[PDB]
């Protein structure tokens, strides 16, 4: 173990800007046709969810609040992104994680969010759906769901490696990293390795690059079979070029630790 990897817990998107989120939510809701528009009482319940999360209240979100959150994230694609941001923030909370990601009903949740990861989608929706998936690994239910749904989610992640949206790429790299944390924890890794390598090949953002290298170091750590697979495959050859990268320093340093294992 070194200062980069192996990560033992999920890397999350924790920035909390509830005023901005709630502001935009109300503004965009106002542009909805009347049939789809959330009511004043619906908006109060979403505000309350944000209050509980942002104030770290011991009061748990209600069934009624989580039902409204579900309704909110099912609104027209042009205006869903603030409600997705409430979800991204809320999904780390045990009550919310369990009621969206549990065994029986989680497939409905993930399939909905995966629909928002379509390459022609609104980039804000793609970004927030990815960040939400990153965040749901903090809970046991979220972790189970991400593993059972991994074929679908990894397929969709890979398709977003295109272009140059740095924030989406960072979220992709973080999704790979959170998967690596799960495989590190237990004993699959070959699939996770193709994911990391495929994205790493194309991404330009150095934060995304860094998180992919952390994902790779985490994936092979403390598993002699995984190190040997990586060595046999010649992973060292594909990441050698990062060993020369001078800024940020963390990229070359993380890469040199991986190269030390291989």
């Amino acid at each position: 173990m070194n200062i980069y990897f192996p990560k033992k817990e999920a890397v999350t998107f924790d920035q909390a800007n509830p005023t901005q989120i709630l502001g935009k939510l109300k503004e965009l809701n106002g542009t909805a046709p009347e049939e789809k528009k959330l009511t004043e009482d619906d908006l109060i319940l979403l505000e309350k969810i944000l209050s509980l999360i942002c104030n770290s209240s011991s009061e748990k979100p209600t069934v009624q609040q989580l039902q409204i959150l579900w309704k909110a994230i099912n609104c027209p694609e042009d205006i869903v992104f603030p409600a997705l941001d409430i979800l991204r923030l809320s999904i780390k909370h045990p009550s919310v994680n369990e009621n969206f990601c549990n065994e029986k009903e989680g497939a409905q949740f993930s399939s909905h969010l995966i629909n928002l990861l379509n390459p022609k989608g609104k980039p804000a929706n793609q970004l927030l759906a990815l960040r939400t998936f990153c965040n749901c690994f903090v809970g046991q239910a979220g972790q189970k769901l991400m593993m059972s749904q991994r074929e679908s989610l990894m397929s969709h992640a890979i398709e977003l490696k295109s272009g140059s949206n740095k924030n989406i790429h960072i979220a992709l790299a973080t999704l790979a990293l959170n998967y690596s944390v799960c495989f590190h924890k237990d004993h699959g890794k070959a699939q996770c390795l193709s994911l990391i390598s495929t994205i790493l090949e194309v991404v330009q953002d150095l934060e995304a690059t860094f998180r992919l290298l952390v994902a790779l170091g985490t994936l092979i750590s403390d598993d002699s079979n995984a190190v040997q697979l990586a060595k046999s495959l010649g992973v060292d050859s594909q990441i050698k070029k990062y060993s020369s990268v001078s800024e940020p320093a963390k990229v070359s340093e993380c890469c040199r630790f991986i190269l030390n294992l291989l």
Binding site: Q20, I21, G23, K24, F81, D85, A124, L127, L128, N167
Partner: peptide, 4 residues
């Protein structure tokens, strides 16, 4: 870049 979202907000807003």
């Amino acid at each position: 870049d979202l907000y807003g």
